[PDB]
């Protein structure tokens, strides 16, 4: 916005935005059970409930990472991220060395970081790394760490597009408005219960997910 001391005229620039709409969506997942099986087996009712709950949180993760916004979609991590810069990558002998390298780049920019949201294959393989004959180059020299490195968490998530790592800080980037919180409902008169002596377990939630901006979230893809 340079002064009239480099004989330049000041910029009267006005920042720009594009707008996104998110309608309410339902995420849900079901477990189907026979009463007889649940009685004879014994723990099965308790287990079925833990299993239906874990299944809904998993389908939730799936959506949040990988998918492009359609119409029946919210805001998804993989869309919002900044595109890969090949320059940040250089000649390595380890998967761990690339992974250390992505993380540091974000700090330079003055982005926010708090966690590593990585491909399941990439995170693991990064832990597993060698120097060409063993010794991990992202974990200590007699100890293994898969919880937190650099003092930030690591999330390994399946479906997010092959061999990619994303620094970002979750709290800034997205926010989840919850129209109604998680609840189980069960119906013995539903589509499936009628045909065969079954009970239907439905476990649902109604969400929306908002993705503020494109910044403070960077993705880098591995060396050529």
């Amino acid at each position: 916005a340079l002064p009239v001391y480099d004989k330049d005229v000041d910029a009267k620039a006005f920042v720009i935005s594009k707008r996104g709409q998110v309608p309410d969506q339902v995420i849900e997942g079901d477990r189907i059970q026979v009463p007889t099986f649940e009685i004879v087996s014994y723990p099965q009712v308790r287990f079925s409930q833990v299993k239906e709950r874990r299944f809904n949180v998993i389908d939730r993760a799936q959506q949040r990472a990988k998918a492009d916004i359609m119409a029946v979609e919210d805001a998804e991590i993989f869309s919002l991220l900044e595109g890969a810069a090949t320059a940040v990558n250089a000649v390595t002998i380890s998967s761990g060395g690339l992974q250390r390298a992505a993380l540091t780049k974000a700090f330079q920019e003055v982005e926010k970081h708090d966690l590593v949201v990585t491909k399941i294959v990439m995170n693991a393989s990064a832990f597993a790394d060698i120097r060409a004959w063993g010794q991990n180059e992202f974990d200590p020299v007699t100890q293994h760490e898969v919880l937190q490195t650099g003092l930030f968490g690591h999330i390994w998530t399946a479906d997010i597009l092959i061999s990619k790592k994303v620094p970002q800080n979750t709290v800034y980037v997205l926010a989840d408005p919850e129209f109604v919180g998680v609840m189980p409902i069960r119906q013995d008169i539903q589509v499936i219960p009628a045909d065969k002596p079954e009970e239907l377990r439905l476990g649902w939630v109604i969400y929306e997910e908002l993705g503020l901006a494109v910044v403070n979230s960077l993705a880098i893809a591995k060396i050529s």
């Binding site: 594009k18 707008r19 996104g20 998110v22 309608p23 492009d68 916004i69 119409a71 805001a75």
Partner: protein, 150 residues
Amino acid sequence: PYVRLGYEGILNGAHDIDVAGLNGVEQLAGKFATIGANGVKLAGDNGTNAVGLFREDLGDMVNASEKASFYFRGGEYYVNISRTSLTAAGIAAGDEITCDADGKMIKFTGTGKALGVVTHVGEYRAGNMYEKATQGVTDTDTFIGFIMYV
């Protein structure tokens, strides 16, 4: 009046030169084109058409939008490409679409130019009878079959 019409309005037609500047730019990439739209789809389903009011809605979706008998003060300054279209209306469904913007000549082929209500986006029908609201930025009342600029 104002429902969509087919007739080489819906699905792209045959190849005119409708681009001044070089054809194809891959700008705006990551916005998908809908399957079907407002009104009656006749002779194909297309969510997007060349020449008209278009709108992002639903985030990373683009579609057709009707500009009625008035308004197009806040039109658009990006158009959906008019290559492959006889009347400069119709453009293929599906994928991240190729856009252009304005600064280029288009062709409408038919009767009346820049008079009456739209009967379908990129069209202008007239007889020189009856006072019916005009909208868009279109040119030239004088010469029918004229090459009109968006």
